[PDB]
Amino acid sequence: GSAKDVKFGADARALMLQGVDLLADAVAVTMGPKGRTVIIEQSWGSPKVTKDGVTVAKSIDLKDKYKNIGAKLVQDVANNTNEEAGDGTTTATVLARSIAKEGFEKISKGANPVEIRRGVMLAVDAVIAELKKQSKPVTTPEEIAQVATISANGDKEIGNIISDAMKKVGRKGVITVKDGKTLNDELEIIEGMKFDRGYISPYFINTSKGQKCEFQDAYVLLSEKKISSIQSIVPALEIANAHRKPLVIIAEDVDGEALSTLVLNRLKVGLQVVAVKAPGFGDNRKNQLKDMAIATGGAVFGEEGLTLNLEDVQPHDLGKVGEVIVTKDDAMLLKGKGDKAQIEKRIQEIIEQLDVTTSEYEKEKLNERLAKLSDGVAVLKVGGTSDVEVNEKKDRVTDALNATRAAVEEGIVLGGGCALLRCIPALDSLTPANEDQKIGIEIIKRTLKIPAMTIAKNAGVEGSLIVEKIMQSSSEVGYDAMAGDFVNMVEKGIIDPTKVVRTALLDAAGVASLLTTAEVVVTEIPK
């Protein structure tokens, strides 16, 4: 029922391309080892300084709504890449801008932009197949350090710290980053618990900068079954309001109504509560719940044998933890002191249950519980002289951690944008079905040179010349833009995770090729 402005065709496409260009320019100045930082004004306090593509992308909104549409779509590209890999958002942004520009250029009366999108998707699938074919698994801790160093703007100490943490707690251990008060970075191993379930509702979030649910010294509520009555959760609320700890509850499903009462209690000032779902579904659920009960210290309500009721909640029957971190994906409970004698007894029980029988699937769960109570959660404490440098370095360490985890998940390819460059001959072996698919394949093939061009351009040299010298060289040679020479990139350690490259390409292509198909733009009149 609001009055709208309707634009058609090429002027609308150019207006969207203007917003795409502004956002991608501001993001693209941060690309590579010679990229620079962006200062973003914050309303509440000090401005933030970042070299992160998705942060710069999400911080820019435009007054002109036709430009803001393209800006929001490239924000979607950057945010989708950050969600799926945690790295490669600047690459995704420049690839999205390139595909948008080349798609907008090749639009005519007889052109079919939908079949151009089809050819773009076909070419991108071929490139992703070639990326998987040229990928290499990570087999050494030196490769781990190299990936973490490359992903952290060539910070050797950050990569060394990440490599040491992954050596101490395993390549699939839980590592988290928080801000340290001293000047130097440090790594500590403390006993920690993590399961891949988050909050049901995103209404409990307390910090706005971190956008998480962070709690210190919280009571742990356990309900193995469904919560029995309102007269069973209200005494728990009164005990939590009595004994000065907030309530973190672990349960099957708190979705409809008890979650609703917790939301309207959170709406009241000061009262803190958060809910997470069960990790497992079978016997592993009960085993992990008993592990958490022994590691916290208290009792369990909801069992079938002892019939302990939530109605008779008591301070000694609940577990106490140090710090609770709740996110969208996983829940962290940290520094939870229990009965250490009972923790050792449960460890003995687990390692004695190891030597009973083999079934090749239950032993994986029992050993992951063993590593849960055995290998501590690594904590990376980032140091600096002020909050701005700490936040910038924290972004870099988070990038390095995400990239290293993606590297052990999927493998590594050539860095410096050279993997996309070496995937160019794979597109030359495709035969398009019609002319519009040929246009799409050509768009993707011209787009595949953009990240190396941007990395070289940020170093102050001519990017197209560098890219031509890269494709003229052998397949192992690429441009080191830090030293400004042509090197064996694998030997020099300039490598990238395969997951990051393929997800940046896929998200950029998927959004930008759909944006290309537009003919009419409908916006709200600014009132």
Ligand X SMILES: Nc1ncnc2c1ncn2[C@@H]1O[C@H](COP(=O)(O)OP(=O)(O)OP(=O)(O)O)[C@@H](O)[C@H]1O
Annotated binding site: which residue ranges?
51, 87-91, 416, 496
CB of 112 to Mg ion, least distance (A): 17
Which residues are within 8 A (CB) of 37 and not within 5 positions of it... i.e. 6 or more apart? Answer: 30, 49, 50, 51, 392
Residue 411 interacts with ligand X (CB under 6 A): yes or no? no
The token duo for 84 is 């799926």
Residue 507 interacts with a copy of itself (CB under 8 A): yes or no? yes
36 or 268, CB closer to ligand X? 36
30 or 135, CB closer to K ion? 30
Q: Which does 20 bind (CB under 5 to 8 A by kind): Mg ion, a copy of itself, ligand X, none?
A: none
CA 170 to each of CA 141, 305, 368, 463: distance values in angstroms, whole numbers, following the listed order: 11, 37, 12, 40
Q: What is the dihedral of CA 490, 496, 501, 504, to 10 degrees?
A: -150
Residue 90 interacts with K ion (CB under 5 A): yes or no? yes
- Secondary structure element (H or E) that encloses residue 378, with its range: strand 377-382
Q: What is the largest distance, in Å, between two alpha-carbon atoms of the chain?
A: 78
Give the binding-site size for ligand X (rule: CB under 6 A). 25
Give the binding-site size for Mg ion (rule: CB under 5 A). 2
Give the binding-site size for a copy of itself (rule: CB under 8 A). 118
Q: Which residues ranging from 433 to 462 are in contact with K ion (CB under 5 A)?
A: none
- Looking at 25-33, 117-125, 220-228, 291-299, which segment touches ligand X (CB under 6 A)? 25-33
The helix-helix angle for 89-105 and 450-458 (nearest 10°) equals 120
Q: Which residues ranging from 382 to 441 are in contact with Mg ion (CB under 5 A)?
A: 399
In angstroms, rounded to a whole number, what is the distance separating the alpha carbons of residues 152 and 401?
Answer: 9
Residue 140: CB atoms within 10 Å: 9
91 or 143, CB closer to a copy of itself? 91
Q: Which does 505 bind (CB under 5 to 8 A by kind): a copy of itself, Mg ion, ligand X, none?
A: none
Binding mask 155-194 for a copy of itself (x = CB under 8 A): ----------------------------x-----------
Query: Residues 18, 241, 327, 367: which binds a copy of itself (CB under 8 A)?
Result: 241
Q: Which does 269 bind (CB under 5 to 8 A by kind): K ion, ligand X, a copy of itself, none?
A: a copy of itself
Binding mask 84-123 for ligand X (x = CB under 6 A): ---xxxxx--------------------------------
Q: Which residues ranging from 1 to 30 are in contact with K ion (CB under 5 A)?
A: 30
205-210 long-range CB contacts below 8 Å, 24 or more apart? 206/272
Please enumerate, by residue number, every residue annotated as part of a binding site for ATP: 51, 87-91, 416, 496
Query: Residues 293, 295, 481, 515: which binds ligand X (CB under 6 A)?
Result: 481
CB of 329 to a copy of itself, least distance (A): 13
In angstroms, rounded to a whole number, what is the distance separating the alpha carbons of residues 144 and 165?
Answer: 11
232 or 503, CB closer to ligand X? 503
Whether the CB-CB separation of 98 and 520 falls below 8 Å is answered with no
CB of 83 to ligand X, least distance (A): 12
The bridge status of strand 219-222 relative to strand 247-251 is parallel
Residue 281's identity, in one-letter code, is F
In angstroms, rounded to a whole number, what is the distance separating the alpha carbons of residues 452 and 91?
Answer: 10
CB of 90 to K ion, least distance (A): 4
Whether the CB-CB separation of 410 and 501 falls below 8 Å is answered with no
Closest CA to 379 of 177, 522, 168: 177
Helix residue ranges per DSSP H, 89-206: 89-105, 113-133, 141-150, 156-169
Query: Residues 17, 20, 28, 53: which binds K ion (CB under 5 A)?
Result: 53
241 or 367, CB closer to a copy of itself? 241
Residues near Mg ion, by CB under 5 A: 87, 399
